[PDB]
From a paper:
Of particular interest in this regard is the putative centriolar CPAP–STIL complex, as mutations in both components result in MCPH. CPAP and STIL are strictly required for centriole assembly: STIL at a very early stage and CPAP slightly later, possibly by controlling the organisation and length of the centriolar microtubules. Instead, we demonstrate that the TCP domain of CPAP constitutes a novel proline-rich-motif (PRM) recognition-domain that specifically binds to a short target motif in STIL. Our mutational analysis of the interface demonstrates a remarkable correlation between the ability of mutant proteins to bind to one another in vitro and their ability to support centriole assembly in vivo, providing compelling support for our structural model of the metazoan CPAP–STIL complex. These data strongly suggest that the interaction between CPAP and STIL is a conserved, essential step in centriole biogenesis.
The sequence conservation of the CPAP TCP domain and the CR2 region of STIL suggests that this interaction may be conserved. To confirm this, we solved the crystal structure of the TCP domain from Drosophila melanogaster DSas-4 (dCPAP) (residues 700–901) in complex with the region of Ana2 (dSTIL) equivalent to CR2 (residues 1–47). The dSTIL–dCPAP interaction interface in this structure was highly similar to the D. rerio complex (inter-species alignments of the structures yielded an average pairwise RMSD of 1.2 ± 0.2 Å across an average of 118 ± 4 Cα pairs). Indeed, all copies of the complex obtained in the structures from both species superimposed well and exhibited the same four major groups of binding interactions as described for the D. rerio structure. This conservation includes the contact made by the E792 residue in dCPAP (the equivalent of the E1235 residue in human CPAP that is mutated in MCPH). Although the overall sequence identity of the CPAP and STIL proteins between Drosophila and zebrafish is relatively low (∼22% and ∼13%, respectively), our structural analysis revealed that the interaction interface is conserved, confirming the previous proposal that fly Ana2 is the functional homologue of vertebrate STIL. Despite the many sequence changes between Drosophila Ana2 and vertebrate STIL, our work suggests that the interaction interface between Ana2/STIL and dSAS-4/CPAP TCP domain has been retained, highlighting its importance.
Residue numbers in the entry: 11 to 24, 65 to 204
């Protein structure tokens, strides 16, 4: 805490002044340059870091939002364990507690990956409706939108 997070990279295309306001809301000025704003109720918090980074803590919504100012990226944490990354190009990365990773590319293609079963290496869902299933052994299952099922073997 009080130190900024290290900015993530998208997945490959392949002295201590604690001012208390009249309403009850607090503003804390830190020596490093940080400004911590607390709501009167103490449920909504926001840390304005020296490097222009923002950390929003919503206790009512159970969310931790982080803005990486340099890279124009958003990171939302949820109570259930879900982490959502939002990149400037529209790329969104979803990471759950189990280990499932869901990349939403700007071309509306979705990449699904889970190192649990590893029967199936990676799953793909395209804009047209095509569903590609890559297997660990090298095999492929292509589910076309028209109803065609392609079974690719060694």
């Amino acid at each position: 805490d009080m130190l900024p997070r290290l900015a993530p990279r998208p997945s490959a295309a392949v002295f201590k002044r604690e001012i208390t306001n009249a309403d009850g809301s607090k503003d804390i000025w830190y020596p490093n340059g940080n400004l911590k704003k607390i709501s009167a109720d103490g449920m909504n918090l926001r840390m304005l870091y020296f490097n222009k980074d923002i950390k929003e803590t919503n206790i009512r919504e159970g969310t931790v939002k982080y803005y990486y100012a340099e890279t124009n990226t958003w990171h939302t944490s949820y109570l259930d364990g879900l982490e959502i990354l939002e990149f400037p190009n529209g790329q969104t990365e979803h990471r759950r507690k189990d280990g499932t990773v869901e990349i939403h590319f700007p071309n509306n293609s979705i990449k699904i990956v889970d190192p649990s079963d590893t029967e199936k290496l990676e799953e793909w869902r395209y804009a047209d409706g095509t569903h590609l299933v890559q297997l660990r052994n090298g095999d492929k299952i292509l589910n076309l939108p028209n109803g065609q099922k392609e079974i690719h073997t060694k």
